[PDB]
Design a protein around this ligand. Structure first.
Ligand SMILES: [Zn+2]
Ligand SMILES: [Zn+2]
Ligand SMILES: [Zn+2]
Length: 411
């Protein structure tokens, strides 16, 4: 049918940190925190099947990966008996639960609580995905990732109800497990104990009318066995032929197609982008559809790049005229919005919305000496412009500013 587009080593050699047109503004080390009771990180705005951020009866809604702050929990005290926020924050992944927040302004979010009651999720961990508003009766499918045991893309249906006072989510009771890594296209746990498989992002393509989804995967094959092809290399310059252990980096942006628009059955397809020999993690893939083009964004780490390559934490991107490619890297290298080198981990999980706004959460900011301040709260929103195969940072907004693009009046 089609071939994946490689993000090549030659592309990655063009990545440039601290390009001000593609660098997030510096986070204030004295940033405010939205809650003294919970951490948040990955944030998923409520959207429809094309990408539009939608409010409901005037209420904006975000879903967050969420965990309790264990400030007064002795299990998270050091030997002196003092709260160890670093240990608490770094243990959040095993405590992740999906919660919702709402606001009529797109900021100053009001906490709504858990989407699912404890026990509904097949796995205790509730990792990231996408909440889709299905209709103007308020039905929502939360696509998300069930992790440990295994890694399984799943969805759960519920409903949103509004009042003059706020928003309530109800009925998220029945998780439907959709699919896991297959082993022929996408790498399995048996092939690699560290395999990546997560982060569903569904969309409908009006060109064929079908329901698809993006997700993070790895190219199938036993860990360490992947061959680096000339197509993975690209046109590298003289002297840049040593790839080191690059065969261990095998990230890809996966694709699947639903049998019909209910999205209850899926067919796994070849990936759209592969990064063999370049980067192990193409996370949280998501589309912006603009001017008939397919803008494909993904989030990655400085330290998941292969040997003798590097880049900043942040969002990378690719653009094509067709869903299945060929894709060309944004800003020539792929980098769309990277962290500044003086605060390289200030934010993560950078999500580009079709209005150009990019949200992220604050992770770790340098503080004093070799100390760091931990966030667990929303970062200032950045605005970028997409022009052809290039992007430009053009504005900055308040912490966690995630407004809607359209408002849906419920029937
Ligand atoms: Zn729309
Ligand atoms: Zn309706
Ligand atoms: Zn990182």
């Amino acid at each position: 049918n089609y071939k994946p587009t490689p993000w090549t080593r030659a592309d990655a050699l063009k990545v440039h940190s601290d390009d001000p047109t593609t660098t997030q503004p510096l986070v204030d080390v004295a940033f405010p925190v939205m809650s003294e009771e919970v951490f948040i990180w990955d944030t998923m705005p409520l959207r429809d099947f094309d990408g539009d951020i939608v409010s409901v009866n005037g209420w904006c809604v975000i879903f967050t990966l969420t965990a309790d702050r264990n400030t007064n929990n002795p299990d998270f005290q050091d030997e002196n008996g003092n709260y160890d926020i670093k240990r608490d924050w770094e243990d959040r992944h095993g405590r992740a639960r999906i919660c919702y927040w709402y606001s009529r302004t797109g900021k100053d979010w009001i906490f709504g609580g858990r989407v699912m009651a404890e026990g509904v999720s097949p796995t205790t961990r509730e990792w990231a995905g996408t909440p889709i508003l299905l209709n103007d009766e308020g039905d929502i499918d939360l696509y998300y990732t069930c992790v440990t045991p295994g890694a399984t893309i799943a969805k759960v249906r519920g409903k949103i109800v509004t009042s003059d006072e706020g928003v309530s989510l109800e009925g998220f009771q029945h998780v439907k497990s959709l699919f896991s890594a297959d082993g022929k296209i996408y790498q399995t746990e048996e092939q690699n104990a560290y395999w990546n498989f997560r982060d569903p992002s569904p969309f409908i393509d009006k060109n064929d009318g079908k329901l698809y989804m993006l997700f993070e995967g790895n190219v199938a094959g036993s860990r360490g066995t992947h061959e680096i092809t000339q197509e993975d290399m690209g046109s590298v310059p003289p002297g840049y032929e040593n790839v080191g252990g690059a065969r261990y980096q095998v990230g890809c942006i996966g694709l699947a197609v639903a049998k019909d628009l209910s999205g209850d059955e899926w067919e796994i397809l070849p990936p759209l982008i592969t990064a063999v020999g370049v980067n192990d993690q193409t996370e949280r893939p998501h589309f912006v559809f603009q001017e008939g083009k397919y803008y494909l964004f993904t989030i990655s780490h400085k330290y998941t790049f292969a040997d003798n390559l590097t880049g900043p934490d942040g969002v990378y991107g690719f653009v094509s005229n067709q869903l299945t490619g060929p894709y060309t890297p944004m800003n020539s290298s792929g980098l769309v919005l990277g962290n500044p080198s003086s605060q390289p981990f200030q934010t993560y999980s950078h999500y580009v919305m079709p209005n150009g706004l990019v949200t992220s959460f604050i992770d770790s900011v340098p503080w004093e000496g070799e100390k760091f301040r931990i966030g667990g709260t929303e970062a200032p929103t950045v605005k970028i412009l997409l022009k052809g195969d290039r992007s430009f940072v053009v504005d900055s907004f308040d912490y966690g500013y995630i407004p809607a693009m359209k408002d849906i009046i419920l029937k």
